[model samples]
Target: MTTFLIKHKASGKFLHPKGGSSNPANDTNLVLHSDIHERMYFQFDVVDERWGYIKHAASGKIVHPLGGKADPPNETKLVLHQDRHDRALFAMDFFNDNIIHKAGKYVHPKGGSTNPPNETLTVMHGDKHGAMEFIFVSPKNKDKRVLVYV
Candidate 1:
């Protein structure tokens, strides 16, 4: 079975992966796991990249991003790694739609070929399993998982 872990940077707490729950609603948390520490990629959706605006489809809880101090729909944090021992593979802030629109191409700071829309962002670590493809998509409606493999 596959499991997910989310870590909230502000509180320094780890959230156990659960179905039918939103991180923004439960609380700002980080997702990390020893199993996931392998060279794997996880993808999630950004409902609104604007600062200070969080939309929760389950409970209808809307909160300002980062306490409303920063801009709206802001992409503040992203951490990608392979097995705790490996250095950070990728990290960045969510600033605008273009970031996602141009992801894997111009937006990627790791310096690699650009990935077009609907294309999977391949992540490889040493020589373990086959390359993992990270896919991102926006749901037509709310209450949907934005990221998934396959």
Candidate 2:
């Protein structure tokens, strides 16, 4: 029910569809794309416990992690169906004690007290610490979702 935007902490781009070549079955990468609905929208359907089946907002395809040897280990992709297997389990974590990535922007560390109200969140791209590592939910409640990275 909490269908919000899952954006990259550093880059403003959202997780969109990628690697859709001639054979889409074996060609789907969850790349960061525009938030303007090019392919970056998704919904987390509660399946088991805190995990669920992730699907594209408009396309309804399963956002999956498969054992694609091409990428090695667990490869991210968008599949045609949800088998509710290991690849479909959804769970994420974020490292604390650093700048917290909010819904729209990031609470950059350099900007501390006396910083402008808007300075709390700064969007940066192609700079240091621009890659996302994991996500964190508030401990008080599941009301807040924050992004964390290197």
Candidate 3:
């Protein structure tokens, strides 16, 4: 089965793996408390063949490397892999003080973007912040993996 690995960008410590069945529902569904109004960052990855896409659950909008369509003109696509891997990463910035609440999702497929038998969903809660990293392994094919370093 596919696995999702999370690590601290600076410390390089492993945080969690998807499907391990160890993480709490709250941690999996990370919700920013009202007190945490500061900016944050998140990064994630999945195997090239794995099906995956980042989106905002509430808005049904795709989440890009930057903050979606509003990203700066000079912003360029952040390449995560050397060759071709379905592996990709994205980021979003928002104020905790804002009255509007935000959420995100990451979906993956059995094959590449063109294939079917995939999964389309959000990241749980709150958009990723500054710099976090995630790695995904294809459940169907262990060889197919994606490493996202945000």
Candidate 4:
């Protein structure tokens, strides 16, 4: 598995579950933190080339967009979910590229463009100030484990 930080373009913060933890509680809000120590690393597990689950490495939980199906309002808040759902699924343009909800909404920081740490993240209809740019970066470990042949 590959591990990295989900860095937002505008505020320059990384996405992480509320209250940084090695094992954060399920359903905790997904927020943005500027400080390196307050951020969490993520691992994207694929369903295919583009679609996949964005997993929180420390807690082993998946990121969720909060609502079931309908278009959730602004400030709806992203969270960590233990199980899979359409809301838990996301589509990335490519590795280290921008990500979007399976339903087509774009992940963004609250207030469109702000630098405040620990601010909750939301999925907006459009990308403002490159807010949808979730550039995956750093600590890309071996993607597949090498098998030993005796």
What local distance difference test score does each model get? Answer: 0.24, 0.38, 0.25, 0.67
Top candidate (TM-score): 4
lDDT of 3 by residue, 1-150 (tens): 113322222223222222222222212322211111111122233223323333222222222322232232322222111222222233221121111112233221111122121121122222333222233323333234433323
Candidate 2 weakest ten by summed lDDT: 97-106
Q: Candidate 1, which ten residues in sequence have the lowest lDDT sum?
A: 80-89
Please tell me which predicted candidate would have the highest lDDT against the true structure.
Answer: 4
lDDT of predicted model 2: 0.38
Across 22-116, the per-residue lDDT of candidate 4 in tens digits comes to 77777788888775552487788887556788888877788887755546555556888787765577775544356677766777776666564
Give the Å error, residue 53, model 3: 13
- Residue 19, model 3: lDDT of 24
Please identify which of the two predictions, 2 or 3, would achieve the higher TM-score against the true structure: 2
The per-candidate count of clashes, in order, stands at 22, 0, 22, 0
What is the TM-score of each predicted model, taking all chains together?
0.22, 0.48, 0.21, 0.78
- Superior by lDDT: candidate 2 or candidate 3: 2
Off by over 4 Å in 2: 19-27, 67-84, 92-130, 134-150
In model 1, where do residues sit more than 4 Å from their true spots? Answer: 1-26, 30-54, 71-150
Predicted candidate 2 versus true structure: per-residue lDDT over 62-143, tens digit per residue: 5544442122221122233434444454433334322221111222212222222321222212123434332333323233
